[PDB]
């Protein structure tokens, strides 16, 4: 799934 736009991409996905 495409990363959450407004959120910092380095946090995604939840480990």
């Amino acid at each position, epitope marked *: 799934v495409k990363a*959450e736009t*407004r959120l910092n*991409p380095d946090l*995604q996905p939840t*480990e």
Partner: antibody
Amino acid sequence: VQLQQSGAELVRPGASVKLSCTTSGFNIKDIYIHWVKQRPEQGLEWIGRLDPANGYTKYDPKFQGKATITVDTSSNTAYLHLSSLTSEDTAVYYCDGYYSYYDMDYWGPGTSVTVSS
Amino acid sequence: DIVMTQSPSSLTVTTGEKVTMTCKSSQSLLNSRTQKNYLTWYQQKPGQSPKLLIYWASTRESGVPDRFTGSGSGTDFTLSISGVQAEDLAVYYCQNNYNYPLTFGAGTKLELKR
């Protein structure tokens, strides 16, 4: 345009409650769900987030022992479970769903919870 | 945890004037690789659900009026309204989208003077 949330809840002190959020119009596996709390006349408070890619949830440390977010992909419904309710839990709980394919943020109408005997 | 400080807490303005509110974070919200600041602004009208206005510190969501502008980088950010109208009456919130927890600021209440 707007997510569906369950109706108002009146629950007694010490009991628990489970609120729901149905993403009508979207496959819940493509939505980033967030739960936000707002006590009367106070500001917005972030509770946690559900990852659509694996089902894992992240929380604000202060809500860790009170809240639990789960999901039922078959019915497109996400849930917020609150345990051992006190008067500090009386608030409106909002369901926030971000659909990154449209770069759009969608909100539910909120569910009002009143903790009283 | 990153602390979000908004100011002023209350603001009274007259229709047509330029409004400016501030949101400061205790740590930088900048991602060096993407060169973007992950600060998000919301608007909440009385009795309604919040609505996202701007993300990435200065990018407006589709449909958001042109009079809403966001700027800033690092730890200092601002939201400006060019020619505030009667319907702009609401509470404005900024939120950390850089790292967990995604904390909200206390908000700035906007009231009109007549």
